[PDB]
Amino acid sequence: ITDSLAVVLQRRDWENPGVTQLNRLAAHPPFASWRNSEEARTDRPSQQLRSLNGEWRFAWFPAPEAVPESWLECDLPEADTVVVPSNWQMHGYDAPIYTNVTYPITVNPPFVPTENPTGCYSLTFNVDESWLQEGQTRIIFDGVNSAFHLWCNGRWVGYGQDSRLPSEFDLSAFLRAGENRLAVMVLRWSDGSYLEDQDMWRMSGIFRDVSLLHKPTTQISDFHVATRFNDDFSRAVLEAEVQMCGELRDYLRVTVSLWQGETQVASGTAPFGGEIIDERGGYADRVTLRLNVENPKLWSAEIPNLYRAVVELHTADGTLIEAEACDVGFREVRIENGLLLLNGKPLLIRGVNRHEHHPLHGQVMDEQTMVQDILLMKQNNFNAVRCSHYPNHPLWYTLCDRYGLYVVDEANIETHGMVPMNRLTDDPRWLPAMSERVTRMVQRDRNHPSVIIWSLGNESGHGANHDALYRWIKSVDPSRPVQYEGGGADTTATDIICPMYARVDEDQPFPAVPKWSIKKWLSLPGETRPLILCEYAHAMGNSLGGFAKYWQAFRQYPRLQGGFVWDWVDQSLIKYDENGNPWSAYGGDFGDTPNDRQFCMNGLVFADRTPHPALTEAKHQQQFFQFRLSGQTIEVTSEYLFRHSDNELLHWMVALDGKPLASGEVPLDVAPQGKQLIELPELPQPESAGQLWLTVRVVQPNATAWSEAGHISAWQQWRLAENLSVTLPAASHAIPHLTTSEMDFCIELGNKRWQFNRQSGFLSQMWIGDKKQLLTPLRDQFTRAPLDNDIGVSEATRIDPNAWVERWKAAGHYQAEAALLQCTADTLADAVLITTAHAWQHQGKTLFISRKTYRIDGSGQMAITVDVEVASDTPHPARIGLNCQLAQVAERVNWLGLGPQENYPDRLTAACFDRWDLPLSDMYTPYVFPSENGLRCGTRELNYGPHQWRGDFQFNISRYSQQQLMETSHRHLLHAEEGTWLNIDGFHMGIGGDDSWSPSVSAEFQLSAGRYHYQLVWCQK
Amino acid sequence: ITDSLAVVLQRRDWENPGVTQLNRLAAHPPFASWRNSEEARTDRPSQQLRSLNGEWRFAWFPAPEAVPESWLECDLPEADTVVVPSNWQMHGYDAPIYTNVTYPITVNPPFVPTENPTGCYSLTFNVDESWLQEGQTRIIFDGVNSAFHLWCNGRWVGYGQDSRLPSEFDLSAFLRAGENRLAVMVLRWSDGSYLEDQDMWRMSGIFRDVSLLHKPTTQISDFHVATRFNDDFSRAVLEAEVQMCGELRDYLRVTVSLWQGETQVASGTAPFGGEIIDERGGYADRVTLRLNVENPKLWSAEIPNLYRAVVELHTADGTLIEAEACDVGFREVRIENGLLLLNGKPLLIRGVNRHEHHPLHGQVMDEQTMVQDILLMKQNNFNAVRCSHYPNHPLWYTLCDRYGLYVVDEANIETHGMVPMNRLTDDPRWLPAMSERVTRMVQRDRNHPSVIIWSLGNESGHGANHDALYRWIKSVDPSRPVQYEGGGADTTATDIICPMYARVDEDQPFPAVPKWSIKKWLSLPGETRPLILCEYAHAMGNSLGGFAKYWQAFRQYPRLQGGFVWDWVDQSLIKYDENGNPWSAYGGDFGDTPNDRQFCMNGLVFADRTPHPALTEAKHQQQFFQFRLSGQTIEVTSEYLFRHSDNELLHWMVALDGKPLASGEVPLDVAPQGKQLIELPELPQPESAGQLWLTVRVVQPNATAWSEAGHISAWQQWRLAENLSVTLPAASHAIPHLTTSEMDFCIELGNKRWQFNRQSGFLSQMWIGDKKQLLTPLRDQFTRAPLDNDIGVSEATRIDPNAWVERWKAAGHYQAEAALLQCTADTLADAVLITTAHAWQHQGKTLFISRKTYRIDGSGQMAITVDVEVASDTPHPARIGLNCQLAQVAERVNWLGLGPQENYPDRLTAACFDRWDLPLSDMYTPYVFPSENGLRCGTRELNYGPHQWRGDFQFNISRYSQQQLMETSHRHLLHAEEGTWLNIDGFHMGIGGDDSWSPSVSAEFQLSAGRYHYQLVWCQK
């Protein structure tokens, strides 16, 4: 009766931050209740721990109030059979909302909307009579979003908030032998939502596991581990504090044993009863053991040395009541003298922020996915990850512990959408709610070695609540530093200056919360903390420009210990078309309102875990070996702090314009922080013209746990020499004929013919034989289909006049009209010479001026020479080159320049100069939100079909015009055009990326010279 | 229905620390909602604020569950008419429990006993229709102990915990015009009780006021004041931050005006909208004004300069929506360089701890009582008070603000009875509950100038919860320091070393939490904070010995800035006898179990506010003027920091053995921290024998607000000279006759006769004429009826073998038997000489040996000469002297020695040497728990009836034998004995008092010499 919906729902606990839970057990590290020490030691599975994951019955309602009392007693006819865990939006019930800042619901704390999507889950299951004789049977939900009430066998059990941490209830007295039934009612919105405003899809449900754990009556209630070291780490102390619940009987003992493999390293036994703590005594229900470990193997992301710790609760006669365990990693984390140290050396964090996202499963995580992510990261030169912005699925820590990644664990607290940001975090009334989001995290994850820093949440301004919570942590677990960026990045609530999007060299001095240039921030008066960016280098779409600038500061300034790129995966979701064809969806694609569109796609990898090209630029910049070339000696520097180059080979090689002349291989013997000298054999040197390039690669000959054999971990290339070509071509056998007309000029020579339209001034067509080559005339191009960064936050509604695109738009770039100023043909001794001039103007303003000369010679080669003039007072153009639509469509593209991957000017350090050959398909980058892409810089020669262009340029080539790109919201809607679109740039502006909501292109990468010159040679084979 | 007891009670919110309140409004400074600025300015009364204090209907139940649903709807036949506020134990419902540490209920957090005394209060009242048109009508309870549920017009309103702070609910929508009814159900025990384990009577009910406040819809929700100063305090800034609730309309304004009297000093006006705080902006519902004040009058306990601040919320057209106000005191509090400063100078805290206690009303406070207390304190040289151990009744701060006392405001948190002490305070699950006890206190009291330090609670060990809360405060209100003694007195949670019962010179090194000698504590390595004792000098019963030692350190060591004596009033309660006669009751006197007996009586004043003699010793030691005598020049030093001696006269005077020879009066002109020189007139000097004494007194000629005219604020006395008596008496005219017998020796001379019993060796009787003088023989006395300090915590059950009494008991002191060793009479030329010797022994051990000579001469004077030998190995005796029971009973006592008040050896600095004459009645000190009392030291002559004794001794005289004292638990049970009991001590051991649970008598005051000598002269007039 008092179990009635009617009664229960009445209190509206989900509209009250003063009730965060009802009858929930305390937090603690992961338990299994093994009843045999070996299983515990070997991490075998505990029969005392049962999963309730699977098929559950579910029914959706638009408001908690629309639930029928019947539900409590019996299933529902119309209840569907759903799989758990899952996100009900993933099943169709309601839509997922992709909003960033702006809260999904209306801001009226602590109220929530009356229309509040309720999901009723139920499960019928069996409890074995043995579980009811003794012990305690409790239930666990690893993640319920956002809040929920619970009934068992028609009785009300409890309530819980906090989507990202476990809620546990003792079912001990509601359970009946055999058949039991659970009724779980999950509310989408609650007062907890006010604290969960992270930039991500807004979903709901029982999205993490459900389990049953059977514990003895007298049991281990919690335990913590700690490791102290001596000056040189040659000796450690493992300290374990154990607490128990139940009746304390003198025959009770505890044994803590430390294994390393099969080998027991240390063991300790004792009975309950701690040291005197105060005037009343000590804890009789606790015991602390201390094990001495000589020459412990240390844990690090470089070498994840782990031990196993077993905690046995037994009686003195040797009888085991129960056992728990955890992996142990010996490491010390400290900030000392402005530096963050790990095991005594200073880290350089090569990290990334990662959300729990699956395109198919929404926010439900699985082992496979976790592992994939981990390996990609490790393969790509990452050390660390930040749990943006809440505690993750438990297994995560374990994997990191094991594979080796540093983890920053973060409280599930984000109130980004309040005004001001502080509003709740400065309010004592939210102190409790917040408090639980921090404390429980710590109680749960504190024993993992991978966790090296605690974070108070994200973007919730800076309030007195943070200060308190930060102090709490420091008191409770001084083993790790605390960080929080809110309120300016350097408040009293953080041990590290941890801004987001601070530029390297430029300051952004917003009122109250400026973002100084990182190099400058450190030397502000009185400042002494280390600086590590919590988010930097916004990887949204065609991005990552300038990435290297960061890497270089990091390397030059000690107190700049790296940062976390934003972010790992694109938060795109899968949708299906008219023919059961899938496609990547984003903000607002689910009729979701209000929404932030593409803003959910900032990953380095696509939702399927396939990489964006940016990923390489990272990989290379973050590489652990560094090179310098001096004469014919290569100096190698190791950035490893703990390990020796012991699975590393260096391959070297010399080549002249793509042609290999020499190769070597040399095994690296460099210690962490060491140098290795490498002298090269006498290097060949040819008479032939061209550039000679040295390229080196570090290879991992043997496979590791996260890499295959032959994995390349680093590389670098240098230009060694140049033999300039002092050779004049063979005087043409033939001579081209010029046929004039009033419409055009024709040039014929051989089967070849070229036509220039005298009215437009462009080369309108060309034939090889009877076949035409163009579909579109060759013409000047000064624009580009806007990248995400060019656009920023500019919308049709709300225009951002500062966004590059807006400027360009406003100035007429996109709609300027050419103007023939001149077009002449002249006959040279051995060639024809065409000469043109256009002016591009908009509203009587001449933006640019293009002046060319085409010169066709007996060789049947045309040489284009171009010279642009850009008005000082017009926004600098995105680019400067030509384009045209070719008639042909070939299978491959071959070029001699940077590649193989897409590379832009402020994003090309990872690319190598060489001869690349790839399929056309590979020259297009499927950024879900179409834009200019696929560029390759420093090209010297490009070959497509019978064409060959030569010079110094950047280019791109696909089946999509710039216009089509520019006009398609999703990549799935693009259609291949008639032939091949070719864009050949003499120059291209950088892509930026410091952030994606303001101009981020550094000046060095802006086409601001005024005068631009370039030349090409088009010809055939 | 869901309003039903049945439903409500179901959740058992009082057995859950996760629910501290339900539907309670936020905390804030005191509001009145004046609707006229002048009333506000002048503190007139607000018609918008109505008291519901008075006659209420009440009914008591043994368990919440025994309440009848009817109650919600209608009064109860048997409900009585009680007055509110009150403590129901004060009315008879149940008993008050006097327990210290040990919790009243059984320790099973968060559970409470099923038998849980519920008090149902109800009130029928009228609401004026106007209040319901608009605005908000809310209710306030200033104190409900311990927890409660609330209904209005049969509807459930909310719940609340925290006995010592206000709970407010919006009744706006439950109220009906005209007749309304409240039903309040108050639970004695709740999960809140675990946090309220203060050493005091355990009571319950609606013990502070009940009010109704009507506010506008658009109102002032909170406001704070702050004052900054310049280097020399010649200029200040008053800063007021105001927040409002309701709809924000551009025509809204705020005006803050500062008055000094009638004179407006400054005013400021502005509209809502603060400065940018973070990335989202500012508070639109707040405004901060800053007023400049030139040469502000500063507030201090010496001179409570106050201003009035008025906060008006109006529209721009000048229309007043509403006004609030508060008194403002300009002062700066800072710890700087190890010192605690007030307005730039370093305080010396002369303070005391005070509980809210009334012998009649239990824990209900009234203005009269508050005021009495204040004045007594100020009169007695106190500067400050500590709110042991919870927030006090609101008016308190106001009075302190006004009369001038420094206040330490303390959170209502004491978990003394847990094991270890830390148990809850270290538990994250209690963090929220604790949090509210701190935060609300601050939000409420933060604007009072008298509050200069915040305290986190008392005796709750040291947990991570404290650290967080301490940081919170520092963040929120950096204007004051925070202190907390738990966990060792010098933790990271306190800005001041604030121990309790630390001795001056001796260390008490308990494990974990030692108590170093205060002088030593300061120089412990790394230590730099100031030290102020939160409790020192346990004033239980006959106490305060050694008080001066403290005063002297305080004066010599800068970093020793004083302390808080423990405590102000005796927590005794009034009971009535068989004839409606009242008497002072204590622990366990209400059949209360378990209990701490007298432990509740440690005040300096009795519950009726009549002083214990200790009070003087304080007054004198804490005096603000200090003297030194050099020749005939008196040097006066002022300890005032801010004020000039401007109501001070110095009276001086010289006297020879009680006889006045000279007097002066001199006006003091000494500045704070200054010296004044005073040269005395040529001082007379007589030939006559005797001691010449100089005595000076400082007088307050004019009355102040807390003192009458002619109040004496200080004094000091010196001995100037001594003219020794070289005069031999006039050779006796007569000669005494000795008549022997086998039973005794008789001496006759004149009407006078003396008889010494030859079997016992004592003077058994004496006659003047036909009248006998003794009822009991004159005999040696080595014991005393144990003071509270002699006993300590020793009980009959649990004996404390270290307690003085125990030692004495065990050694046979109390039951030793005399032994005539010798008894002889001899005839001298002009006198008779008796000579005796006894041995006191117990179990064949001779404890002491007494050797006398009585010598009676022609003058009819007996001279007693005594010489004791004390065994090295026996506990030192409490005293050494004689006693006897006189037959007479006279009305007065006159003596020449220290007085006039009771004075002991380690407690006599406040006493003066002179001739005192008082009524017998005044020679007895009515300590509720009878013990040795009334002593007066340094006596040279004592007169009672026809007797006169002369020498150097300490003595006491009443109608109660030591034995009667020793055997009566309460003073009300003592009965006057046949005549007058006289105790004349050659020597007396000190009383101690550093604490009352371990030996506190300093060695200098212990009778440890072995050999003791003394002489008397008994005679008549």
Residue numbers in the entry:
A (entry chain B), B (entry chain C): 3 to 1023
Q: What did the original publication write about this model?
A:
Binding of a single-chain Fv antibody to Escherichia coli β-galactosidase (β-gal) is known to stabilize the enzyme and activate several inactive point mutants, historically called antibody-mediated enzyme formation mutants.
ScFv13R4 binds to a crevice in each subunit between the N-terminal domain 1 of β-gal and the catalytic core domain 3. There is contact between one Fv and only one of the four β-gal monomers, with the nearest distance from any atom in the Fv to any atom in the next-nearest β-gal subunit being 28 Å. Because there is no contact between scFv13R4 and any neighboring β-gal subunit, Fv binding can therefore directly stabilize only the β-gal subunit to which it binds. The mutations E358K and G207D are 16.5 and 22 Å distant from the nearest atom of scFv13R4, respectively. The center of a typical bound substrate or inhibitor (e.g., isopropyl-thio-galactoside [IPTG], shown in Figure 4) is located ∼26 Å distant from the nearest atom of scFv13R4. Because mutation E358K is in domain 3, and G207D is in domain 1, scFv13R4 binding can directly stabilize the region of the protein near both mutations.
